[PDB]
């Protein structure tokens, strides 16, 4: 119950910032644009320098227009709202938000370890132990997130940033929604998508549970349990609920996955009575000190290495596209509350 007690204070805290969110906390002029750190479906993430403090940050830039044409208004407002309110060790910290004629911005804490992905891809696979360590932190993160009526919707190695201490940082909240009850938007990353989503059934918190299981699998095996060259081909597999585990997985891991990768909601771990505790209590997580993990007192099995302040060596190289600002304020009514 130290949890049930902890979250209580968590909730209270979230509620407040949720009702009274932060608006226009800065201006482009205070920032020095360095390199592109990465890309997403709605915009780019650049490495930034804060002139006066001398701090570097990752800055999420969105083009008012693109968001509109792609219909991401609600989602974009959702992301800043929710982000500016949460507070957990495994989620990125947003520091400044603000807009201008042309774009929307989100200044976040710069996580230099680079993406989980890049490392995952390089190394090949993760030792179940190395996996667990990461898992465990997503397990805790969902626990917090969910208790706030929040739904993540985009877990994928590409969104899991490795920090100076080799701990996770979940970035990109663009599909995260505060929602009591069912939701219906079709969004996410194909490989991670839950069946209920594809099938357009209306879905809940449990989708986040399925992605966890896809995550653990991609972590420990080297590939996703459902892959093909076109998303469609992927979809058919997901709804197929037919999964092959590598000969190298423990009977334990298999067990977990089978339950997370459950096509049936009234049967999928995470969505049951005991809720999370079905997961946390799993034999797989037998050697897990949830506290130490939370406390960031655990054994970082791997520590990316950062040369200096503003080192973009754990990130790929991107093409640079000049960001401009219209002398005409665009799409202002749609973004009143940003």
């Amino acid at each position: 119950e130290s949890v049930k007690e902890f979250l209580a204070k968590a909730k209270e805290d979230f509620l407040k910032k949720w009702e009274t969110p932060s608006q226009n906390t800065a201006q482009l002029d205070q920032f020095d644009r360095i390199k592109t750190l990465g890309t997403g479906s709605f915009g780019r993430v650049m490495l930034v320098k804060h002139k006066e403090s001398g701090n570097h940050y990752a800055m999420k830039i969105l083009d008012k227009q693109k968001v509109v044409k792609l219909k991401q208004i609600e989602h974009t407002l959702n992301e800043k709202r929710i982000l500016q309110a949460v507070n957990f060790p495994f989620l990125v910290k947003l520091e400044f938000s603000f807009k201008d004629n042309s774009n929307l911005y989100m200044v976040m804490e710069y996580v230099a370890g680079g993406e989980m992905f890049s490392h995952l891809r390089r190394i090949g696979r993760f030792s179940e132990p190395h996996a667990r360590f990461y898992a465990a932190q997503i397990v805790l993160t969902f626990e917090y997130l969910h208790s706030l009526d929040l739904i993540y919707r985009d877990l994928k190695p590409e969104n899991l940033l490795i920090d100076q201490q080799g701990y996770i940082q979940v970035t990109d909240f663009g599909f995260a929604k505060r929602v009591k009850g069912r939701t219906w938007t079709l969004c996410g990353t194909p490989e991670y998508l839950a069946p209920e989503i594809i099938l357009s059934k209306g879905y809940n918190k449990a989708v986040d549970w399925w992605a966890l299981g896809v995550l653990i699998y991609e972590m420990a095996a080297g590939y996703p349990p459902f892959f093909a060259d076109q998303p469609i081909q992927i979809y058919e597999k997901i709804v197929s609920g037919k999964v092959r585990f590598p000969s190298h997985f423990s009977s334990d891991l298999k067990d977990l996955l089978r339950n997370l990768l459950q096509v049936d909601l009234t049967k999928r771990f995470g969505n049951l009575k005991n809720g999370v505790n079905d997961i946390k209590n799993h034999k797989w997580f037998a050697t897990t000190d949830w506290i130490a993990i939370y406390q960031r007192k655990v054994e970082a099995p791997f520590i990316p290495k950062f040369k200096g302040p503003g080192d973009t060596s754990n990130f790929d190289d991107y093409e640079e596209e000049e960001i401009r600002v219209s002398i005409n304020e665009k799409c202002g009514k749609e973004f009143t509350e940003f």
Partner: peptide
Amino acid sequence: TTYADFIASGRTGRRNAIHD
């Protein structure tokens, strides 16, 4: 090998999210 199958595949790079 599946791994073998995965590497030749078209989605080994960074995966974009789907709007619609």
